[PDB]
Design a protein around this nucleic acid. Structure first.
Ligand SMILES: NC(=O)c1ccc[n+]([C@@H]2O[C@H](COP(=O)([O-])OP(=O)(O)OC[C@H]3O[C@@H](n4cnc5c(N)ncnc54)[C@H](O)[C@@H]3O)[C@@H](O)[C@H]2O)c1
Ligand SMILES: NC(=O)c1ccc[n+]([C@@H]2O[C@H](COP(=O)([O-])OP(=O)(O)OC[C@H]3O[C@@H](n4cnc5c(N)ncnc54)[C@H](O)[C@@H]3O)[C@@H](O)[C@H]2O)c1
Ligand SMILES: NC(=O)c1ccc[n+]([C@@H]2O[C@H](COP(=O)([O-])OP(=O)(O)OC[C@H]3O[C@@H](n4cnc5c(N)ncnc54)[C@H](O)[C@@H]3O)[C@@H](O)[C@H]2O)c1
Ligand SMILES: NC(=O)c1ccc[n+]([C@@H]2O[C@H](COP(=O)([O-])OP(=O)(O)OC[C@H]3O[C@@H](n4cnc5c(N)ncnc54)[C@H](O)[C@@H]3O)[C@@H](O)[C@H]2O)c1
Ligand SMILES: Nc1ncnc2c1ncn2[C@@H]1O[C@H](CSCC[C@H](N)C(=O)O)[C@@H](O)[C@H]1O
Ligand SMILES: Nc1ccn([C@@H]2O[C@H](COP(=O)(O)OP(=O)(O)O)[C@@H](O)[C@H]2O)c(=O)n1
Lengths: 255, 384, 295, 255, 255, 255
RNA sequence: GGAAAUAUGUCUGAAAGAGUUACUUUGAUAGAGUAAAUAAUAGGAGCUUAAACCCCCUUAUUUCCA
């Protein structure tokens, strides 16, 4: 079981992060929803009971993440699991000859800052936090998990910045896994496909329905509960490390 | 002798005739039991191997089997037997082997019954002290050159007076001197030593120099014969070493070095000649000193090993200081008492200073006549 | 105690100039009956303690030098060291060790066997035993650092034998992690009698070309008191083909001791296995023994 | 929980397959062991209990696999899970110039037959039985799980045939997942790294120790129970499909 | 340049192998077509010129490949390049519930034997003759190129056997590259996508046009001359080794 | 050939960029070294000849890249090829427990900006410039090549930021390739391994010897001329697109 | 046979250098830090010690003996 583990979940106020927080709290763990101030995470943290404590923070900001980690340590006294589920998406073509439109550098920079730079910042600070943990029987001090879309492997049109950030996460998953091996922290990456969440819902609904129909099997948008279950499986398994798991549903993003 | 009877029994078992040969026969004819015993057998080497195998007597092959020479240990006594041969062709006939002999004095072969079988009147040559060559003397010289030296040694050992030399033999030797250069230097050195330790050594050496054998042997053309004569007179009856006389003849150390290199004699004799030449000119007794042997004693003390003691004794023999030589014999190198630890106790740590102080104390001890004590030396030692 | 007084008497006599007293060496003196032989032991013991004092002096000097270097860096304060433009962390020793380990594992799986038979213990003394162990360590290191390492076998090695104990003491915990096969069984059991070739300096056969389908057995032996024929005797007893290096053929050996140390042997064998000619392979022979290469 | 499931495990009389069968039977499911008749799996079936039955068969032999599947259907009347954990390993350099030795073709053919052809034969045969099932409420009729090796991605020297077989398994993972998607069967692949089992018995002990030391974390040979847990997680999650999961412990095999 | 090189091209009678042979021989090299006797490759060898010779062989059979290699050595004396382009394709679904039709194991075994076993057989047999060559500058003795397919990565429906074979080729690429690295032989793999060749022409014209329109860019079927040029580039470059190159044109196979 | 083309090579004043510029200019093309003003590119541009022209700009600066591309167009009138060989490397462990040291965020941010953001900025601007061109016979308006690293696939300890940046390049390769497919621009990636360059040659002699020994075959650090030749091959072949070529020499970076 | 020569067990060499092995996740001099082995030079003796040397015996190779 996962009873007694303390989880810090970035972007836990919605979507996959909220699903993971729900599952882990229901299993008896203790979560810390690390999300933006005006994100509504306070309502979710209150809903989930004592085991949750909303920690208003911005992953791209070092000070905010340090404050959130301090709050989590004060409340629960330790940190054992970290889940980087915070991120954004942008839809903009690199260049559009017909419209004479070029991708803005600002959007690319912001997407890198949130998806990639923020994930690395959280990873390093959380590793520092978990270093104090006493090794368990197997020597595992803690676990870190990162979400990185399948766009890192087979991206689509207008997905340059996303795909870049997610590919960065995928690339850095291994060297970090080696860096933290002596410490005793297992780093893993889940590469979800398409899921029913606000991020996807922001896009047109008809194309979302078509993409949902395009998954070989199951032919429905992945439920976030499946992502939470996979995260729990990764936490439980004491041998998974330095790997990218495609929770895709067998879908290969068409051109 | 019992060993002789055992050998006779063994060879009668073999059935091949055997007879003592050479120096042993000469000594027996002289009436003196032979110091060295040499046997000649009609048996071929194969027959010798067969009979030794059938006998069980332990065998010794001293590499002389090329000429049929073998040794057998009967009753813990080694008997040396060589196959009778002619000039290596083995001959059973004793007359032919005697003809193959070099000098008549050794040609005869004695029967084990005590009866001699001489084929060239060698026994009468020995009785008369004269020297006769087997067959044609010049032919024998042609056969082998080192023999010249063998004849010289036999003359010195046997002839009662010097100058009893056959002019034919002398002229033949002078003519054949060319061949003597080729012969190996060991045998040359051994024969030279034997001749030197022999009688009439002065006359023999003078005759050899007259024969001009030195250039072929490498001896210096000019030698201080007069000095050599004086040295021989002084050491006459004093067991001189051959190198001593050679050095007396020699004038410079490096010529002796070249002569050694030619002969390849032991380095001990090299040093012998070297320091002999050096000291005969440099080191001499100090009559002004209360003890004329004191300079030699101090020099010995300077040296390391008692080999130097024997060396200085030989030098004294060379100088003819018989009284001083005796005093040296009774005199013993006193031990220098002070050790390096005494100096260390005095308060000296630097090793080089310790050695220098030890040397200085050695000279002071010599000056004191060796009567100075260890504590006297320590008082002499200057604290530093 | 009596040993202590004897050592003090030595100090007064200043032979071996003993300076410090240790329990292990004192009990060695008590055990070492022969003082005539013990003279050299005490001499190089005091040499060892001096060397320790000189090591302390040199360590002080090196600490001074390191302080000089660090304050030189402090004064320079250049900063922008390669603009902080590096590609790897400075962890090169660990990476070298790990790569050597991977190569050793690959060789153990598919390497050419090379056997050291530690069956000469009965023919060695303490000093020879220590030299043999040191040479074995050096040879194993040279094999490890090669590009095509051998698969080293340690045959006839008694579990509790003197060689095993000394090797374990010298390797500390590395012994269990070493990538070499150490077995009680003699080399004959492990391999067919046909492929084995017992290298030795006495065998009439002369090695000409390194053969990759053969197992070369090297006698882990140090022979101070010359005992010719020991390795050849063993090879004849087991009925194993033998070979000797062509030292005469390619070098003007003249008069010298044909025996070569274990490390030189393994270096020569590695060079030959790497397709090196005989001159390059034999370069490792000590220069003193041979005047120069023939033609 | 997996109560009531029926699983057909190939090579389930030893190593990873045995651990998987142990875990599934302990959870409440029922398993059928499909290993070689001389493998001595009957003792394992007796030990596990009544919910496990040993069916002698060879994966390469089509008739034997059909007989084993028929026996499983007769005993339990259903096949919801198939696990392919039966294989062999061959170490032989492709060509050794020094020794003048060339990799034998018989070894390569045997390795392919046992691993790749065996896995595909089991997959195609069990596809019919799983299709016979009435689709679950979610839709899936059953799950097929394959065993592979990290050699499929980076195989060390003297591993040509094994790497070929496992790379074939990896390649065909996705095509089969798409082929069986219409009939609601999920195909997943697990690529274990090093795991203490009789397969490693071929290697020398020192080599095994070195390889274990070279695992980033945990620095040990993976226990079979971890592989069994990962298999259970794959079975439970209804969205994993057509993916290779490197259960390797972050180890990457150098030459 | 490639002047003076000797290249053994398997399946050079027609298709990609033929284009590679044409390019290499035009550049001044020498080729040895190695295709089945009934493939009519002797006519192509005659057309190419005196430099090219036809060696009828079956890559599956060891004796046939040995005879072909001996003939090539006799005719030229060296084998500086070995291209493995021989292969066959079968489109058969793993299981079709609607029609109750199961993939026949015979087709799978035949496809594996022709593609994967054939390529490994050619590799192991030609490695000896490449080793015979004394090392040139840089210590290279030969270059072996193998033609995998994108189906090894993203196979399509009813492509289980072909994908398995190509995935096996891709998996064994690197281990062989490590096996032959000490010898000095560079092993490379090319994964072409949709190339206009006799293999494709048999497929429906509508399918061909749809595939040509499916490629992002160039929106056409790759001319075999492009493969030939890529093969030449791999040959010339002395540092490419142990890698898979996707000469596909940015096309990812349709789900 | 490549005669008459115009190539914009970022970081062309040193290392791989300079080698590519040298090769292309030798072939008759025209180049533009887009490197930092203080790098020293003006001397190289003068040395190469009238064909090569130095344009001082910073890839992270949009205005500077626009100025450089405008200069290139003015001096040559077109942009046919773009090479992104400009980047930096920073080595640092994510978190060191014994020293209590944490990876600095500024290093990560600056490495990302220089490598990934710089590459994307150059890509978009030069894509606009190329799209301003006229299509060729095959419709290829231009080519864009990006220099990733093997670290993007298997990073070493202390290569978190480098690996992140190069993995971002790898991930965004294909999405951009699909973005510009209608325009007619082919995006490709080259992942060099270890190459004798100022980045590596500056290391101690022993380190360079060890690294050279690491490469399976050849056992030497890759010459930059090999990278330039591979770039030329990619330019010439009109079918390579959206693919990552590992010009590594079969080396897989050690843990 | 008796002489006459040499022998450095990591290499140079006379004390010192280059070497060797085990540990330190090395922040750019690790170009380091803790440790291990290190026997007046074939093996044993006298003479001694500062270094030593010098000689006796034993052993391994070598050129010379009616
Ligand atoms: N939705 C999908 O199907 C899908 C697929 C692949 C990957 N992803 C990734 O999964 C993750 C979860 O997204 P989701 O689907 O739950 O959508 P979501 O919008 O519900 O999740 C994003 C969450 O991140 C938080 N967040 C954003 N920026 C933040 C910042 N700077 N600091 C702190 N919190 C911040 C938001 O408040 C929100 O709670 C994202 O990283 C997304 O890129 C999603
Ligand atoms: N052992 C590892 O660390 C490791 C790593 C990666 C992959 N694998 C793969 O995992 C699987 C499990 O192997 P393992 O580690 O349990 O070793 P194992 O030998 O215990 O497992 C192999 C099993 O397959 C059975 N089997 C073999 N050939 C068979 C055939 N023709 N028909 C039926 N059954 C057959 C054997 O009887 C045995 O039960 C293998 O496929 C292996 O390649 C293992
Ligand atoms: N055609 C494509 O677009 C495409 C795409 C990806 C991969 N491939 C692969 O590329 C290769 C080239 O095939 P192609 O497209 O030229 O088709 P093709 O049929 O023209 O070429 C295949 C060749 O293999 C030969 N061959 C088959 N079995 C053989 C055997 N046992 N011994 C000797 N020769 C044998 C055939 O005679 C023929 O010459 C094949 O391996 C194919 O699977 C092709
Ligand atoms: N050197 C290797 O072994 C290796 C291996 C894999 C990948 N790479 C990557 O290959 C590329 C080639 O670099 P290299 O190896 O020649 O090293 P390098 O430093 O010699 O080349 C980098 C070039 O980029 C320029 N540059 C740096 N920052 C810039 C900026 N902001 N704007 C403009 N120009 C800038 C530099 O002035 C220099 O000319 C780099 O991205 C490097 O990371 C190198
Ligand atoms: N010249 C040479 N030829 C062959 N092997 C040699 C050699 N010199 C040394 N060796 C090897 O190195 C080992 C240590 S040398 C010890 C030699 C010892 N006389 C003995 O009986 O072997 C030898 O056992 C032998 O295996
Ligand atoms: N140069 C030589 C050497 C020896 N010989 C002879 O060979 C014999 C062998 O020497 P030996 O010592 O055995 O002689 P004897 O002791 O038997 O007299 C000598 O006696 C000489 O007669 C010779 O004639 N010429």
């Amino acid at each position: 079981s996962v009873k007694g583990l303390v989880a810090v979940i970035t972007g836990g106020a919605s979507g996959l992060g909220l699903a993971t927080a729900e599952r882990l709290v229901g299993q008896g763990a203790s979560a810390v929803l690390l999300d933006l101030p005006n994100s509504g995470g306070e309502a979710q943290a209150k809903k989930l009971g004592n085991n949750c404590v909303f920690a208003p923070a911005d992953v791209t900001s070092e000070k905010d993440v340090q404050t959130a980690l301090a709050l989590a340590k004060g409340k629960f006294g330790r940190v054992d699991v970290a889940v980087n589920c915070a991120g954004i998406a942008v839809a903009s073509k690199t260049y559009n000859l017909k419209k004479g439109q070029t991708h803005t550098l600002e959007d690319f920079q912001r997407v890198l800052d949130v998806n990639l730079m923020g994930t690395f910042n959280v990873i390093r600070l959380v590793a520092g936090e978990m270093g104090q943990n006493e090794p368990d029987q197997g020597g595992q001090r803690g676990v870190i998990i990162n979400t990185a879309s399948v766009a890192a492997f087979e991206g689509q049109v207008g997905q340059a910045a996303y795909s870049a950030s997610k590919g960065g996460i995928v690339g850095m998953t291994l060297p970090i896994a080696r860096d933290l091996a002596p410490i005793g922290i297992r780093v893993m990456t889940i590469a979800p496909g398409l899921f029913g969440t606000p991020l996807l819902t922001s896009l047109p609904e008809k194309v979302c329905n078509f993409l949902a129909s395009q998954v070989p099997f199951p032919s429905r948008l992945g439920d976030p509960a499946e992502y939470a279950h996979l995260v729990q499986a990764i936490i439980e398994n004491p041998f998974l490390n330095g790997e990218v798991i495609r929770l895709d549903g067998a879908i290969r993003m068409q051109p | 002798t019992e060993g002789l009877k055992s050998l006779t029994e063994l060879f009668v078992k073999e059935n091949h005739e055997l007879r003592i040969a050479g120096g042993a026969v000469r000594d027996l004819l002289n009436g003196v039991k032979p110091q060295d015993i040499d046997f000649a057998t009609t048996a071929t080497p194969t027959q010798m191997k067969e009979m030794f195998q059938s006998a069980g007597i332990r065998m010794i092959n001293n590499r002389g089997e090329k000429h049929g020479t073998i040794t057998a240990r009967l009753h813990e006594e080694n008997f040396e037997i060589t196959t009778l041969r002619i000039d290596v062709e083995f001959t059973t006939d004793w007359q032919k082997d005697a003809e193959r002999r070099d000098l008549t004095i050794n040609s005869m072969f004695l029967g084990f019954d005590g009866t001699l079988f001489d084929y060239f009147n060698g026994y009468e040559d020995l009785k008369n002290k004269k020297v006769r060559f087997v067959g044609h003397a010049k032919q024998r010289i042609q056969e082998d050159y080192l023999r010249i030296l063998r004849y010289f040694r036999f003359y010195g050992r046997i002839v009662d007076k010097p100058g009893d030399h056959d002019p034919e033999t002398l002229e033949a030797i002078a003519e054949n001197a060319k061949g003597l250069a080729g012969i190996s230097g060991e045998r040359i050195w051994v024969e030279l030593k034997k001749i030197l330790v022999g009688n009439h050594v002065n006359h023999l050496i003078h005759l050899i120099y007259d024969l001009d054998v030195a250039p072929y042997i490498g001896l210096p053309a000019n030698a201080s014969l007069e000095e050599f004569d004086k040295v021989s007179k002084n050491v006459d009856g004093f067991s001189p070493k051959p190198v001593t006389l050679l050095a007396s003849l020699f004038k410079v150390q490096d010529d002796v070095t070249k002569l050694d290199l030619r002969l390849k004699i032991a380095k001990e004799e090299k040093n012998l000649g070297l320091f002999i030449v050096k000291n005969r000119k440099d080191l001499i007794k100090a009559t002004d000193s209360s003890d004329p042997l004191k300079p030699y004693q101090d020099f010995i003390i300077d040296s390391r090993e008692p080999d130097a003691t024997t060396r200085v004794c030989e030098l004294l023999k060379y100088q003819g200081e018989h009284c001083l030589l005796k005093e040296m014999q009774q005199w013993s190198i006193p031990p220098f008492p002070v050790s390096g630890h005494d100096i260390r106790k005095v308060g000296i740590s630097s090793g080089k200073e310790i050695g220098a102080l030890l040397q200085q104390l050695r000279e002071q001890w010599k000056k004191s006549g060796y009567q100075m004590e260890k504590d006297e030396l320590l008082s002499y030692i200057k604290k530093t | 105690a009596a040993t202590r007084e004897f050592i003090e008497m030595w100090r007064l006599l200043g032979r071996e100039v003993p300076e410090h007293i240790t329990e292990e060496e004192l009990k060695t003196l008590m055990e070492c009956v022969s003082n005539t032989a013990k003279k050299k032991y005490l001499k190089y013991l005091y040499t060892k303690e001096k060397v320790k004092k000189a090591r302390q002096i040199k360590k002080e000097m090196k600490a001074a030098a390191r302080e000089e270097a660090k304050n030189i860096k402090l004064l320079e304060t250049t900063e922008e060291d390669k603009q902080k433009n590096f590609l790897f962390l400075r962890l090169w020793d660990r990476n070298m060790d790990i790569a050597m380990g991977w190569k050793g594992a690959q060789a153990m799986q598919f390497g050419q066997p090379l056997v050291f038979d530690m069956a000469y213990e009965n023919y060695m003394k303490r000093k020879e035993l220590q030299n043999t162990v040191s040479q074995l360590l050096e040879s194993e290191g040279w094999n490890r650092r090669n590009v095509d390492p051998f698969h080293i076998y340690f045959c006839n090695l008694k579990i509790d034998g003197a060689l095993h104990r000394e090797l374990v003491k010298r390797y500390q915990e590395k012994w269990d992690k070493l990538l070499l096969t150490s077995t009680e069984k003699s080399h004959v059991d492990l391999f067919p009698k046909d492929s084995i070739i017992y290298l030795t300096a006495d065998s009439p056969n002369v090695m000409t070309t390194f053969r990759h389908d053969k197992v070369y057995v090297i006698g882990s032996f140090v022979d101070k008191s010359m005992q010719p024929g020991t390795s050849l005797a063993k090879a004849k007893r087991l009925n194993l083909a033998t070979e000797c290096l062509p030292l005469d053929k390619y070098l003007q050996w003249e008069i010298g001791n044909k025996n070569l140390t274990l490390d030189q042997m393994i270096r020569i064998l590695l060079c030959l296995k790497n397709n090196g000619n005989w001159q390059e392979a034999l370069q490792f022979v000590p220069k003193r023994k041979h005047t120069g290469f023939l033609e």
